[PDB]
Symmetry: C3
Subunit: 106 residues, 3 copies
């Protein structure tokens, strides 16, 4: 449900970044990604729906989103200094982390 | 500090930022806000005292402080580059989020 | 990695930062510290091995690594601006936090 919609939002803004030209477009898209990742962090993903809220699996899930958030931050920092090409290359690796998380927990 | 005291710290420093003259005052206030938001993640609002510490409700509460922390980060990054007016405008957005969290959990 | 090996990594990279000659070296060390701290967030330290993963003590432990992560970020923000000496001074606060965490949780 809502976790899946957050995953899709992350992918949409990744495509937005991959087809961007100036630094402010990349920044806007990464900011939307950060918001979607934070919204997903509080969800219970489909694979873990049968586990206790107190399970170590859910803590690992949430810390994985913290890792994604610091990767988003690095891309955003590159974009905020006008390094558009480097920001887009960092976002290419974000595609991996985002969709690996998607595929791990769906 | 308990949750209400940490929220008071957030609001006191939002006022300091609103009335600030230079970048050093804004940076000091935002650093205090960051410390308060992190400390608040260890607290429990009175209406959630009967919930499990990792219940979805308490996860939502802690991740709401993560959302605040990333908005604080944006404002502090602006203040660190001497962008005082942009940092104050971002702190005005911070007040909205702080108020919404206050209303949600008090 | 387990908690102790992550603490080893944090201490090793604090030494690297202290002796570092340029911004690339400081950025690399701080990035490794960030990774070790995020990994340690999924661990259980020796003092809390008799506590539940979702106990209040373990939530407080994870928030302590969030605090460290934001201090790492401050030093990394300085290094990203080429302010090597200021970043090393900031890493003095990391040493205090890391040492206190070692003493509290070993
Ligand atoms: Ca009060
Ligand atoms: Ca209640
Ligand atoms: Ca060892
Ligand atoms: Ca060693
Ligand atoms: Na070593
Ligand atoms: Zn947690
Ligand atoms: Zn930053």
């Amino acid at each position: 449900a809502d976790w899946e919609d957050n995953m899709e939002t992350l992918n949409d803004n990744l495509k937005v970044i991959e087809k961007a030209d100036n630094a402010a477009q990349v920044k806007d898209a990464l900011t939307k990604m950060r918001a979607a990742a934070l919204d997903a962090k509080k969800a219970t993903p489909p694979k873990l729906e049968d586990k206790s809220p107190a399970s170590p699996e859910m803590i690992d899930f949430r810390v994985g989103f913290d890792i994604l958030l610091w990767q988003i931050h690095d891309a955003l920092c590159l974009a905020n200094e006008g390094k558009v090409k480097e920001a887009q290359a960092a976002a290419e690796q974000l595609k991996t982390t985002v969709n690996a998380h998607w595929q791990k927990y769906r």
